[PDB]
Amino acid sequence: TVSLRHTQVRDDVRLRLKMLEDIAQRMEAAVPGLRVELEGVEDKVNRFEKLPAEMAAGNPPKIFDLFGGTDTAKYVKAGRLLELTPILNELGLKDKFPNLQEFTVDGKIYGLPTAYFVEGVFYNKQIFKQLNVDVPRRWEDLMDVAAKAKASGFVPFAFASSDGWVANMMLNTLWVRTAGDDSVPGFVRGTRRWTDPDVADGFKRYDTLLKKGYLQEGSLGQKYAEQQYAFREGRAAMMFDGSWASAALVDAGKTKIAEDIGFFSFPDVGGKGDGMINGGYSNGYGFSASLNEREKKAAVEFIKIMYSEEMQKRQLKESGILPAMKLSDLSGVHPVIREMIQASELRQFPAFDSIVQAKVRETLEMCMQELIGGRMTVEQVLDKMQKVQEDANRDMK
Ligand SMILES: CC(=O)N[C@@H]1[C@@H](O)[C@H](O[C@@H]2O[C@H](CO)[C@@H](O)[C@H](O)[C@H]2NC(C)=O)[C@@H](CO)O[C@H]1O
């Protein structure tokens, strides 16, 4: 009766859903007669089809998994999102968020991130030992690691691209490595182009990984979770992924290689984006603008419970999810988690889909699956990306 849309649908992320269910009872106990109705929708389905449709028709869920940047800006300007500054003041929470920028439109706040993310390279410390390689810090090191991994029968990069957004993760970072993080805002303001040779350098580097079989071959047939299977079952030396992936990686009778799992920032390439890491405060929950009194009370309770040090610590301890809020203790965690916090000290850039329009993101997904399938060249990809980028920029008016 009060709808709570989330994307925690995989069995592997059961602890994250169980936390949502705990939050849902606590809301119900706080608000008599309240009935919370959790609805899980697969991430890409929720974000790129279901929720955009509901927003256009004006009937979004009351509480919903929401992304900052482009998505929030679109629903704000359509009047769909509850402004959260009165509530944040009531609860004393506003300044326990180090970064709400993706959710701030004209100084006003329309969502709350539940996590801080980084994206980089998970690796198997025991496979690296076997191959007698150190952590690769630059491109030519990476090539050596990948060549030795493959020579020994390991997949260099566990990789699955049936879900198109997965292919864009390492890509994001590759073209930002070569062209700098300012390339992506440049795309939407018309001062940088997808076809520019410094952008293209990162695409060609990605294609080199394809051409050498360092990105897992046959990946177009595999759903996102399959790259995590390959890595956690010890078949791949590395996997480029987000920090949220540890919720599916390192516990119990699934994971051969739990303690020898590590993480490093992607090697430098001698380009304008060296020394940076993909990360930010992008994903959390938004709230319908159409809330009545019980509904608002439920949303306030949800905020009070979810955005607390108790729940932030719980999801860190249980599932490795890095906190979006300021914490008191935060101590005692898996090595891979130290290594991620370590790697997050670098200069940061947000995911490209927080900056570009939906149509551009969708086109990059489809273009990369064609590139992975050998059905488009890098030249064709960037030509098409730039045309769509021009159209999107014009349609912003
Ligand atoms: C709070 C949390 O852990 N959210 C995770 C999401 O961030 C993640 O989705 C992906 O996040 C990237 C970083 O913002 C985006 O660039 C990427 O587009 C996005 N993917 C989709 C399909 O929206 C998902 C992955 O399933 O896990 C969440 O738990």
Numbering used by the authors: 49 to 445
How do the authors describe this structure?
In conclusion, we identified and characterized Paenibacillus spp. NagB1 and NagB2 proteins as SBPs for chitin oligosaccharides. Binding experiments of the recombinant NagB1 and NagB2 to several oligosaccharides using differential scanning fluorimetry and surface plasmon resonance confirmed that both proteins are SBPs of (GlcNAc)2 and (GlcNAc)3. SBPs, a component of ABC transporters, are responsible for trapping ligands that are imported through a specific pathway formed by two TMDs, and mainly define the specificity and affinity of transporters. The structures of NagB1 and NagB2 were classified as subcluster D-I and contained two α/β domains connected by a hinge region consisting of three strands, with the substrate-binding pocket located between the two domains.
The crystal structure of NagB1 in complex with (GlcNAc)2 (NagB1/(GlcNAc)2) was determined at 2.0 Å. The asymmetric unit of NagB1/(GlcNAc)2 contains two polypeptide chains (A and B). There were no disordered regions, except for the nine C-terminal residues, including the hexa-histidine tag of both chains and four residues (Asp299–Lys302) of chain B. The two polypeptide chains were virtually identical and formed the same folded structure with a root mean square deviation (r.m.s.d.) of 0.57 Å for all Cα atoms. The overall structure of NagB1 adopts a typical SBP-fold consisting of two globular α/β domains: N-terminal domain I (residues Thr49–Thr162 and Ser330–Arg395; Fig. 5A blue ribbon model) and C-terminal domain II (residues Glu167–Met324 and Ala399–Lys445; Fig. 5A orange ribbon model) and three hinge regions composed of antiparallel β-strands between the two domains (residues Ala163–Val166, Ile325–Tyr329, and Gln396–Pro398; Fig. 5A cyan ribbon model). Domain I contains five β-strands and seven α-helices, whereas domain II contains five β-strands and 12 α-helices. The ligand-binding site is buried at the interface between domains. In both (GlcNAc)2 bound structures of NagB1 and NagB2, the first GlcNAc interacted with the tryptophan residue Trp213 of NagB1 or Trp217 of NagB2 and formed hydrogen-bonding networks with surrounding residues. The O3, O4, O6, and O7 atoms of the first GlcNAc formed hydrogen bonds with Arg95, Asp401, and Ser330 of NagB1 and Arg96, Asp408, and Ser334 of NagB2. The second GlcNAc unit formed a CH/π interaction with Trp292 of NagB1 or Trp296 of NagB2. In NagB1/(GlcNAc)2, Arg64 interacted with the second GlcNAc. Although the structure of NagB1 in its ligand-free form has not yet been determined, considering the conservation of a.a. sequences and three-dimensional structures, it is likely that NagB1 undergoes the same structural changes as NagB2. Thus, NagB1 may trap (GlcNAc)2 and induce the expression of chitinase genes, such as ChiW, via a phosphorylation relay in the system.
